[PDB]
Symmetry: D3
Subunit: 303 residues, 6 copies
């Protein structure tokens, strides 16, 4: 008889993007990293957790993925894939295959596709003034990873960091969504200050972070005080310098700028949500730290 | 780098449908008819013109089509039917994509047609206004002639003018119609002139006044109807409009006006200020026209 | 360079079915009903909640839908659609259009498409012996709807039933998933006994239901005792008679077999989950009633 | 129950994303055209660039259907682009063309344009290779915009001094397309960056024929003549002239050849018609509300003559 | 950067889901064939029905690629079907054909079969309308299964009494297809429900030619002859004979015409070859490991002669 | 009622790829070459045979192709090139879908080809076993002849046999190869006989022993190489296999054996028990063959 049918879709690309089609939202991300530990299996697992986090940070549910590496261009990859498969299985994400890239520097990662149901798509631009900044994993891995490279540390010294890098941000995403977070991102290569600033620039606001409230590995502090830290840290710190307000020692600023690998989620929530955060977090079995709040002035304050 | 792409489409089916996709509008129609003349080739050509008319009436440009018939189910003759359809389609710059056989025993042939309505020019039947003139581009009365031909009362040679008109594409009429900024349009086929005029009135929530003495029809059509010679479809069309018909005209006239038409012309509404151009526009486009009436406020069909 | 790509999909049809493609699961359902109240708007809203429940019952997240009615074949539909749109908006589901059917009997409903993330697809065949039967809405609407038709009741008398028929089963789905239910279905036209039996047949087990533990409207009891009940009730009761074991009065069996409109979810959970059901249910803001347990013998016991 | 269905399509592309697509009787044309700022008004830049991009489709006898915006975005500089888009949207609305989105390009040099898709109904696909000997060359807009835009940059002229040219650059070639189709033109192209001579030569090469152009019949802004004489002209004019020097025969003063080679922005259509068509060209143009100038005729010798 | 791409496809279907599809040089054939139980062994029913369905593709010179199971399922009666599927799977594996799934039909009468898709490489698409006069008719399996399956139902015979026929019904016509293609056959069909005469007539009608069949050259089960004489035969045989009575010329005893019209299940291929091909037919068949019988020749008169 | 449908596919790209979908396997390859003869038509035909060989070598049946060249970028001659490609494609029952122009200045032409491997018969280069015989279906040494022709040392008339072999499709050879149940196969082209033999050894983790006196090559090829006349590609191929080459043969022989071949024959491995059929099978299929060696355990190339 009489029939009416409509179809609509939108694609936004910034192999990264967001796709909406008749009510469903898909997010696509790509993330590849250089070895962080001298164990192929751990590298595959960590790289996978790191890549999936791009999706979790958007409130997404990872669905499938493609392995990406410099194969042939850079037996070890067999262990790398084994580690990636285990982490993917834990994440209930399907590996659809792999793509080789032209690069001589050893790198591995994934391109991931996820879904954001009921329009629950979270960006880095919805933050408002007077909200709390919540972080779900410690920082300082960059410092530890360098310590390893310099032969100052051994893997056994940083098992806590490795355990955190291995951890999926699925529980963190659930906490973030449960508290109706207005903005979210994960903490990786740009450091805690860099990613916080990303939220500040895209939301047109500023942030106040309290160093004493930021979780980090004791060993990261010990190493940074002895001038042991990655270059990315200096690059990150300088990137926010023209917007940074702080009278804290340089080592604290370097620590806060240290490139993180497979870090936790960094998101903003209203002060009222503070009433249920601990209980919600406990039920979900995920850690959280309240590190500061957003301000109107477009600067980054650290005290 | 930063890229944004959108896509949207809508499909509206009534049977026959209209599809819009990112700015372009396609119209789809289907029309099959029983033999109207003894010549298989002419039957193919006439059915084709008749099927394309559906698209022309909507302001569309026919693009492609699919032949539909019960061949092998109702063979050497269908070769001529296709030949006629192909020649007419070539004339209409429309491509034949193939054919489909339906479950039927009664000899019938026609086409499924797909066309496009450029610049959003999609002409419907619900945009007519009161005080406009009703224009018709082809005479009526073919149903009565076809009956006579079937009855053996007439020969094809007697109705050559009707055959020429049935064979004629409504593309020039569509252009005239668009050129005069028509507010509504439809083609005249099986439901008779009154029926299709009523379709416009119904959809435009308006009325129409038609003058019998201004309606073009074949002389032979009048002679046959006066001898009680006409299609049963004429009675069906008349009885269907009688609840909305206001007229005192003799029966033969109402029957003639209700006579099912094959590959008829276009019936459309234009403003009276266009009456100054219509003649020169029609001469250039090479298409005849007849002012048969005007729209009125009262929702009825006034046949005077 | 070297590339490997795989693609796989499965389609199962019983316009109803399940579709799996590279890790994602979609469920498609169709559900249309006759008017249940003399208010077009309420009918549109209720029919919508009822149709979406087919998806919720499978653990699905409704995404989009198409309206289905006997339009032209049977101004009122304008209010029907208005009601359907409101309920769809509440459900965060997109209406893509409508399809007309050949029928002279006034009916309206939806065809719905939903998603089941992380393989969380729930059927009616995973129930095991010794599990608890949980129900999330009262039964007895069929009796009340007849009472209305017979002019014995007026809409105002059954506002509680109307409120329940209007309610989305999204919170119930969340409870059901949170408790890791092994099987689930919603309660509609086949009555509570019929749908329970559906779980029994597909899971190859039986069920024991306690009448005194089943939630139902007081007015439904009053009416059924006075021989006021729909035919579907008798049809449902007879459908399970050759598998029914009970010494309860006929009115109680008729009530339990009464066709429900937009009923709650009926699912099975392990006894241990009983420890968190109340708290979980309270957090989700959804009611629940423990009406019985599954048994090994393939019969339906009611006491 | 017998059934027979056929499907066929052909795609011919030139390079980037410019091509012709035919599918079961319908013909689609795709083009892309981006230009550097023309005037100092952001809004006018978006509007003019749009008219310019749509022209590639009109010139092929096409009806624009939809488009995609293309600009350096963030790679060149974000308040002017808002105005640029506003101008584009207004011009597209006028052209009844839908904007489907946008695409960014890595370019430090400010540029904006559109990728456009249009259709050519009833196989009315007009190319640059169907011209015959003895046909008339028709132009629908004056030339000389390059020289005026140059003078505007040299501070020699003010924005207001070229309102006539701006009005012409803003005008859609849809009416010109209709005239061209109505007169059954055998070949058509629009006049842009390559200058009148260059675009005329494109028809000559692809049609393997020649052209004879009469300078005194060519429409151009008087202000453009005033400037070329004063050595005021874009370098693109010199390049264009040099591009056609191997096939050019003329004894005219250099300033005339420079004017004729001057890069045009959003110019008119340049097409060929049979001589008999002169009988109704004037009446048709007035009805369509478009201007036209008969600037010459095609000849057999594969050369370009200007006198 | 110049590019030209073309695409074309044609689809011809007969009714249900049986047709021929051509797309840019490749030809796909689709067929569907379901039969009622043939023997009392569920496994053999699935295996035989499969060989029977695949035959529709082999007969067209095709290579089966994938299939879909089709059965009444739940509409006819669920332990036998498990065995039926097992038989189908074994036969498909042997045919190197992938089972993509299944489809249920509303039918109370027990039936099972397959929808099959295959390809005809290098345009080797063999039909029933390319036969010429003076060609030989070749058959690759005996006929008479209808009469034996009938006797099995009448309790006249035991399952074991027809192991020879069962072995032939189980055999894939892939080797026969290879022989047919190797000898450059001009037309081919398989012999099923319509009987030998009926399927031979199909070639005659579509090729607009005639056939002359020699009864003494036709291979058939001796047990089949024994039964027809005793009035033991399927009614389908009578129907088939009547279907060809308007085009049949023969003076042979009725039991011979009944045998020749007897419905066959999973029969051999019936194809036409030029007489010169007899030179290598025997050697080729032995190499391919397939049997063959020359049963007659085609003639000009559009009739069916049996002597 | 109750219906279940599944779908699955895999794509493996190496550059060139293999695609499997619900039981069918398609292979995709690409091959372009510089002019080898002065005749534009012969160049088109030879390049085509050379491009199709990639598919034949895998046991495939070519279905369609796309022409690839730098025409207009490296015109009246390319008309002859296409004519030659079209004639050869017709012979191969392969359809030309169109063409693509690449960014290159050096005159080159070839095709992108798509083919199918029926009944799962996908022949690779990693299934050879020790103790098998190495079969070659066309002589080698065309690289040296083409060099001589380019140098003006030879005329096309002098190398008509090489041209006939370059023009020949490897479809008959593929059939022979499949007929003898070959365990591995490849075609001989630019990497020379030793190079392609090594590809099989490398992928099969086996070795090969080749007898120079059993290898077919054009007499003129031997004469030219002995006069220091040969393609630079020959030196490149030889130096590439020298780390896996065990031989004491004179330089000219190794160079000849490493000489880049154009539209060469197939090189495949079969069991010695097949040596009793190969001759009659080859006569029927109408294809020449040469037993040039046998596979060995040691992972090297023994050229004796």
């Amino acid at each position: 008889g009489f029939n009416i049918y409509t179809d609509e879709s939108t694609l936004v690309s910034i192999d990264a993007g967001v796709y909406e089609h008749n009510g469903i939202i898909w997010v696509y991300t790509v993330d590849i990293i250089t070895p962080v530990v001298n164990d192929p299996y751990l590298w595959g697992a960590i790289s996978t957790a790191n890549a999936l986090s791009d999706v979790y940070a958007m409130g997404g549910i990872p669905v499938n993925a493609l392995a990406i590496s410099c194969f042939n261009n850079c037996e070890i990859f067999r262990e790398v894939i084994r580690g990636a498969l285990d982490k993917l299985r834990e994440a209930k994400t399907v590996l659809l295959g792999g793509h080789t890239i032209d690069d001589k520097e050893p790198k591995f990662g994934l391109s991931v596709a996820g879904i954001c149901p009921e329009g629950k798509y979270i960006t880095q631009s919805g933050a408002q003034v007077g909200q709390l900044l919540i972080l779900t994993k410690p920082i300082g891995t960059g410092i530890l990873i360098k310590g390893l490279k310099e032969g100052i540390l051994k893997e056994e010294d940083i098992n806590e960091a490795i355990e955190n890098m291995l951890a999926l941000n699925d529980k963190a995403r659930n906490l973030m969504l449960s508290l109706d977070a207005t903005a979210c991102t994960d903490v990786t290569g740009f450091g805690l200050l860099g990613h916080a600033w990303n939220i500040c620039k895209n939301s047109n606001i500023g942030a106040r972070i309290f160093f004493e409230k930021v979780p980090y590995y004791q060993l990261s502090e010990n190493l940074v005080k002895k001038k042991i830290y990655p270059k990315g840290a200096i690059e990150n710190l300088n990137f926010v310098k023209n917007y940074l307000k702080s009278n804290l020692d340089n080592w604290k600023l370097i620590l806060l700028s240290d490139p993180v690998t497979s870090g936790g989620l960094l998101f903003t929530i209203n002060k009222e949500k503070l009433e249920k955060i601990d209980e919600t977090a406990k039920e979900l079995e995920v850690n959280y730290w309240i590190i500061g709040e957003t301000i109107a002035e477009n600067v980054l304050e650290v005290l």
